[model samples]
Target: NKLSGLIAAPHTPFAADGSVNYPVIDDIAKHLIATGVTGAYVLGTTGEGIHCSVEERKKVAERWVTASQGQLDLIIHTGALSIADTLELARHAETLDIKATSVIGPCFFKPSHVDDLVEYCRLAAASAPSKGFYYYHSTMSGLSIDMEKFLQAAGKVIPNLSGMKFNSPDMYEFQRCLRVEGGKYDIPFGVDEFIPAGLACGALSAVGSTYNYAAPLYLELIEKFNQGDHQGVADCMDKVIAIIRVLVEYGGVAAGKVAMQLHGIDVGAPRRPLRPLTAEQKADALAKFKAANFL
Candidate 1:
């Protein structure tokens, strides 16, 4: 695996007791891999990184890593509320010999300067023994940057920083990476809608939550685009984006869980404060899914 194609940040299906359902986790992993996704990015934003506790995160990581069994490239998002906590997770990932690991900038508490992000990456990188670190750049975390500036800043302090997930909706920031000096960083577009734009802007890989359903289409998009066919890529992207429209209609993450359950994965409802889909939203979502041929 060149680590390209669809990398599904799958939904963490929780049991009624709030503990992870490992059996379902194995089922989901096998389904994703059997469908021919390049790999799975577990515990990423789409997997509700901040929604679970540290112990829960480790459980997901350990289960997925064991379930994948060195077959699917397992990338863990170890970023958490505290730097120490993140480092501990990174060490655990390394011990498990995971394919790779990524960290989001510290969020939830408040905004932090770029220096904090740099120190975080450095600390995380130092903790890992071998499998490299990629930062999941998230605007929702209140930590963002001009991609070029951020890359340059990382170069100053954090050595061994491998790649990053460009999670913003900002296309210009993505394109800027292509023109910047020494910007060899592996920039994976975090959102699926930007797949084509990302490819045009030197992004050969993508990590998205939607890959669970759109794996084949995304794999084809990559192969077709690599063969110099932009039309095929555009058409596939439009179709996948249409399916994503259904997910968004239900309301981003909350609706995502509904769509997962509807698709037969049974990831359960999102946590409190983010209620399940309302009746109106569900009806509308069903209509959208039907229109997209996803129903």
Candidate 2:
């Protein structure tokens, strides 16, 4: 089955002291439901998926699965720098109640071609043969492989191949992936700022970090799109862009976790390498959020 509508790439809740605060996942799930989110893409870019070690991710997946409570369709981002970690994570995800799995192409050494990228997807998909798998393609990975070529090749080898996270900023390529095999894959557009562009290109759903807190706004945006309200659609997107600008201004996840904290969810701070917002930063971020007018 394919996932559609707004899916949040949730942040991994950290304790103020820096341990995994798995209990807050239930709060996140409740918030998602309250805000009208349809799915949760756990351990995603926003979730800092790669920061957690193998043992940590296993329990992390279980927490989110328990938190999902059968309402949110869940997809686990099980990619790791090493093939071994990625496969093990994929296999564990298969044991859970998740909808599917997704992996970014190896970013450290990096895959320079479609063959390498497709094989990366092939192995991970096979590890979790019971579940569908997706290639989490972000141009940030340094792989310039054409998705049209990647899909054609990956589609042949991986029988459980789902679609992709579709993160490239290039609209033409995104539109192209949807048509790769008679519009067969479940390509959820990943860029938060351009949900309209994605919907216009035939993406049935979208996944984004912003959806965690701002899903009601996106839900309103989608309603406008559905009613064919061109001016209203643009208006909603304009507000979405304005809020996104604020998130970026203060730093995305850094700003986001604080916003979640302010929401009373207390998902807490970001994991290291990424710093938590300071008091001044947190205050100003909430102020910026309040002024931006889209809560």
Candidate 3:
């Protein structure tokens, strides 16, 4: 697995009562396939994995696997603050026939060294069915260890170590990670907005929440980039940037849910504490998206 093209980081679908809505996954999978998405990265930050109970996470994973029916590649984010729970999810991912599993660095008591991060990933990788990718989302995880160093150290230890979900803004380090061991690893870029920059750095693939609604647009961007049509690429990127700008104004997760609804996917609001958009906010965001021709 080279893990190329756009992989959609899906939101966890919920019923009106706020319970996990397993059946919605059937529609979700179909939407991704029809939109030209290459795969699904479930239970990630966008999927609200950390917020859900382990049992809830397991159910979501199970439903996605069932709905996809092996039609799509699946990457399950099994990371948790507790190493034990992380390992448990890794084992479960193996049983579900997921293509790969990823673990974010522990946030509660962050790892103090590259070796500490390597060890955490190594243990979880050992339990996974296929390759395990360390999710280096420093912005959110706050585990700002040197990723270049972690790759060198972890690459030697974790045999099943696939590569990483490189999400940091450090392009210097990203290029270095891509060149590690002569590019033997399968590192997928995680930043959505600057995907063209990632591609210039030799990124073969990327995963992001925006791809859920905008995969077709991104696929066009990639095609334009390959043909050296810089202006076309810029146009595509501009559309996404406009959409994301409105999303942030209305509340990122809640606004994203509204965007999906506009596309007819209706995955409900995010879990508690991360509030849903008010009626006014939702209408404003939707109107902006329409005005921008994103609808």
Candidate 4:
């Protein structure tokens, strides 16, 4: 259970008609392999996952698994607002050759108690008894459950409980969760801008949307850290932070798809409630990418 290196949370490509563009999955997988991304974390927030229906989600998972060609590891996110749907996805994940399956808390009505949440995790983990399970501890969930508490409770029930994608800002709590069960779990730090800091606090791997296009750069960041080049590490990180600032200003998810396009992979626009950039905005953003040398 050593989750080390970059896992790209791939953006699900959509056609002009807004349907999932399945053919693009092949290119996405090839791009990940070419750029040295360790795995594909499909159907996450960057993928605009829950925005699609169950049928589409199934097809997307199938395409990702098939297109991977066993070159890239796979982690399928199988969480939905409907608990019933979440369980179904979990069951479906068990049938695949993926490395693991991750689940995010239902945002609409998150469990109030840790046990209640643990129970939610237990049910899903049990559904996929064969595959590894990870809790995608998202900051956006608006629930303040301590991960170590959940991990300790979950460790007993979920036999294949691998670890979590710790995406929140508190590295202190993240460090503590990393210590649970004598550091038995594989806690990959999330947040693109904080990869260096996470590494300082003992992060082994990271999951990010930017990794889809910026894997080579982050790989350099890791090498600099390994070489004890502090100045060099900061130089690489500032560029990423700058890129993140541009992305956040344009709305992170949609602008990330734009960055993918800038790097020569057009993953198309985000789903609704998250709008794509207009031509003017894309030009403005692209100009900044050029000025900042972020491409």
lDDT of each: 0.74, 0.86, 0.83, 0.88
| Candidate 1 vs candidate 2, lDDT winner | 2
Model 3: per-residue Cα lDDT over 1-295, one tens digit each: 7787888888888888888888878888888888888889898888888878889998899998888878778989999988889888888888887888888888889897998988888888888846456554556778769888899898898887788888888899999888888888888999888798999988899888888887777888899999999999999888878987987787767777777876787788888978988788878887887766644
lDDT of 2 at 81: 90
Off by over 4 Å in 3: 129-136
Backbone clash total for model 2 is: 0
- Model 1 residue 195 CA deviation in Å: 1.3
lDDT of 4 by residue, 1-295 (tens): 5777999999999998789999898988889998899888889999988988888998899999899999877889998988899889888888988888889987888787899999888888888889888999998888878898999999998999999988899999999999999999999988889998899999999999989888888999999998999999999987887788888789988788877776677777888878889999988877766665655
Q: Kindly provide the TM-score of model 2 when superposed on the true structure, using C-alpha atoms.
A: 0.97
Q: Kindly indicate the candidate among 1 and 3 with the higher TM-score.
A: 3
lDDT of 1 by residue, 1-295 (tens): 2367667888888776666676888878877887887778888777876788888888888989878877787888888888878888888888885867888877665545666667767888778748866777878777544656767787667666676778887888777754455656667778787777777677767888777765777788888888989788877877777887776666677666666654568776666666677768766765675566533
Candidate 3, residue 170: the lDDT equals: 88
Q: Which scores higher on TM-score, 1 or 4?
A: 4
Cα RMSD of all models vs. native, in order, equals 2.5, 1.2, 1.4, 1.0
1 versus 3: better lDDT goes to: 3
Tens-place lDDT per residue, model 2, 164-237, is: 99888889998889988898898999998988888888889999988888788888888988899999888887
